[PDB]
């Protein structure tokens with residue numbers, strides 16, 4: 083029975099509006115409704131993994147698990163296994179997998195982050211799950227961010243708190259936040275970004291939605307505009323939105339958007355918005371393809387419609403050679419040559435690198451680099467040909483060319499990371515000096531760049 087080199091992943095996000103679901107929710111898991119939808123010919127084909135995020139979820143874990151599992155069994159005739167379930171307040175994540183995957187999944191982690199302070203602490207935040215699927219790390223975050231059209235900056239702050247403080251994945255990757263710990267990271271939820279148009283334009287916006295003319299609305303979507311200005315979700319992807327705004331509907335129909343201010347809304351307008359989103363970030367040159375992104379039309383218990391996204395995702399096998407794991411393979415080496423970091427910092431400490439990768443027995447610390455001044459004000463840290471030669475555990479090119487090296491640049495004075503990035507070993511050639519490059523981030527914001535050349539020796 084061969085190990086897979088691809089899986090499909092279903093991501094669902096639904097703000098349930100504190101109401102129980104209707105009796106049938108199968109359209110959600112079938113990716114049917116509006117937007118980029120799944121072909122009917124695939125309806126019986128189970129996804130490998132289903133990740134369900136809910137917000138304002140009124141159900142117990144048991145109640146929702148029974149609905150989800152019975153839904154999938156009706157669609158696929160497969161009884162899915164529960165990988166993980168985690169709930170913070172009314173924010174929940176469920177991971178289900180096909181039974182054949184039970185002994186491919188390990189290192190399951192869960193965590194939550196509570197956002198805000200005092201007034202603003204008590205219902206918003208995020209839950210997450212991570213695990214290994216054979217040789218591939220997978221992370222999933224369901225966040226319910228701050229509501230209200232005039233709170234985009236608070237949402238951006240909520241995002242940074244969640245990626246700083248959510249403790250998923252390999253804790254040995256200590257310099258790295260969740261945006262670097264996984265081969266594939268999926269971040270979804272009620273992100274609560276709104277279409278920023280004047281209140282007076284409510285009926286005009288409704289008109290546009292009825293005509294399925296989303297361009298002039300999407301150009302005012304706060305998440306797209308904040309991402310384009312690098313204020314949030316730096317280096318994440320989102321599929322093009324081709325479905326109507328998923329909020330705010332009158333319940334029990336989809337014929338009406340309920341946007342006007344009410345005591346129940348704190349006298350706030352809720353212009354039709356794409357509150358409910360799926361984004362992802364995968365390591366460089368790993369296969370990931372969005373095969374659906376849309377909303378259901380027939381689930382109407384909430385003032386939000388459910389959103390679905392599905393993905394092809396490249397995965398690798400749990401590789402054993404005669405040498406590693408448990409020793410190095412002298413036929414393998416990674417050399418970083420003529421490398422330099424460009425940092426935005428004004429500090430003047432010395433810096434060193436750390437190289438982290440599951441292709442190494444443990445992380446590797448470099449010597450300190452040589453600081454110079456860049457022509458436009460910047461710090462340039464030069465490493466020359468001084469960097470330690472990295473000794474992978476396995477030299478086989480079918481393994482090594484699928485690996486990645488995480489890089490942290492750390493202050494000698496404080497041992498704090500000033501920047502993190504990732505280099506793919508999926509090179510055009512081995513035994514050949516080739517350009518490499520990663521942006522460097524810290525707390526998910528851009529802090530610099532790392533560039534240079536690599537020379538990779540494999541057993542071939």
Ligand SMILES: COC(=O)C1CCN(C(=O)NC(C)(C)C)CC1
Pocket residue numbers: 402403404405
């Ligand atoms: C399931 O993978 C494995 O366990 C093998 C795979 C290949 N291999 C060897 O060929 N070892 C010899 C040369 C000592 C015979 C290591 C172990």
